[PDB]
Design a protein around this ligand. Structure first.
Ligand SMILES: Nc1ncnc2c1ncn2[C@@H]1O[C@H](COP(=O)(O)OP(=O)(O)O)[C@@H](O)[C@H]1O
Ligand SMILES: [Mg+2]
Length: 333
């Protein structure tokens, strides 16, 4: 029985695919730090940390390693958590990393896996894993565009010839959408709300396009009054949430358009045929596909299972390592 794993080390969520088992771990990429005698201690990791949240730290939140020690501890914790005692002790590991990850960041990730016992580590770039999981024909000379909207980043890439031809990331994704909602409630309604409430609003009435409709549906939002601090409830409409999200949505649209203008022709025309493939959790924002379509004049398809696409692509590379080439940049023990 195998301990080989592929890790989607996301800005917001970490997923681990295990050989012969599938996705065995899907947890937020968060650590709870405790202050003990002026020292900071990694007290809890993942869903256990989120459930007890001490200071919250998301060490990968912006698509770069913010805290190396904490990121390493988080990686080791997750690897240890999925380890099977009755399985091999020296597994092969794949980790998905952002395209712009630096040598130092990549070395840190490789070392984390080697220090947890891996006999070999291969790194794969996020948009390649996303394309593979979305089922894009990244072997053909046909141009493909994938737009992966995650937590702290959106990555856009043009693929062909088993390779990335263009890639660019911007620090706008689902986190900035939540922050926009938090900011809207504070400035427009004098109401302090937390990330959990912001995410519920985004999922329930959040949308990339205002209702022609008028104001659309509405929900009740519970928070604390800004000046007072007393619990207060405020009704918010789909129109209002659309207003709140307009700015980060606009920045995601701009990222796609910037990528398009930088797309080396020939490839331009291969794109307007089958369009753009959206993946990542951020792609689940209602109407974002239509909004991108309307402002690029390009067709837009949302990948099946956009939250899991990267993990499933990594898993496919893990299971069928002969299927493709040098998608992996590898390091042995
Ligand atoms: N139904 C939904 N509507 C809008 N956003 C969503 C939905 N479900 C999840 N998300 C968002 O997806 C983002 C996480 O996407 P993910 O691809 O896991 O990011 P990363 O790979 O960077 O960790 C979060 O900001 C989360 O709020
Ligand atoms: Mg991701």
């Amino acid at each position: 029985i195998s301990n080989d794993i592929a890790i989607d080390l996301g800005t917001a969520n970490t997923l681990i695919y295990q050989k012969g088992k599938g996705i065995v771990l899907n947890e937020p990429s968060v650590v709870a730090l405790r202050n003990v005698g002026g020292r900071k201690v990694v007290h809890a990791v993942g869903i256990e940390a989120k459930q007890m949240l001490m200071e919250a730290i998301r060490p990968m939140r912006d698509g770069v390693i913010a805290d190396f020690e904490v990121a390493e501890e988080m990686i080791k914790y997750f690897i240890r958590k999925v380890h099977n005692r009755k399985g091999s002790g020296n597994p092969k590991v794949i980790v998905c990393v952002p395209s712009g990850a630096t040598a130092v960041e990549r070395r840190a990730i490789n070392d984390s896996c080697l220090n947890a016992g891996a006999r070999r580590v291969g790194l794969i770039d996020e948009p390649m894993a996303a394309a593979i999981g979305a089922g894009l024909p990244i072997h053909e000379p046909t141009g493909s565009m994938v737009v992966d909207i995650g937590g702290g980043t959106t990555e856009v890439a043009v693929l062909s010839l088993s390779g990335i031809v263009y890639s660019r990331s911007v620090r706008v994704g689902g986190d900035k959408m939540d922050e926009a909602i938090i900011s809207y409630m504070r400035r427009h309604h004098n109401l302090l709300i937390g990330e959990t409430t912001a995410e519920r609003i985004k999922k329930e009435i959040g949308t990339a396009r205002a209702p022609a409709d008028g104001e659309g549906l509405s929900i009740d939002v519970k928070g604390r009054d800004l000046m007072q601090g007393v619990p207060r409830e405020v009704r918010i409409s789909e129109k209002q949430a659309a207003d709140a999200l307009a700015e980060p949505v606009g920045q995601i649209v701009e990222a796609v358009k910037v990528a398009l203008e930088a797309t080396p022709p020939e490839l331009a025309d291969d794109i307007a045929d089958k369009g753009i493939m959206l993946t990542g959790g951020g792609a689940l924002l209602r109407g974002l596909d239509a909004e991108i379509r309307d402002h690029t004049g390009l067709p837009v398809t949302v990948a099946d299972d956009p939250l899991s696409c990267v993990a499933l692509g990594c898993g496919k590379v893990l299971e069928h390592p002969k299927w493709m080439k040098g998608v992996l940049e590898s390091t042995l023990a």
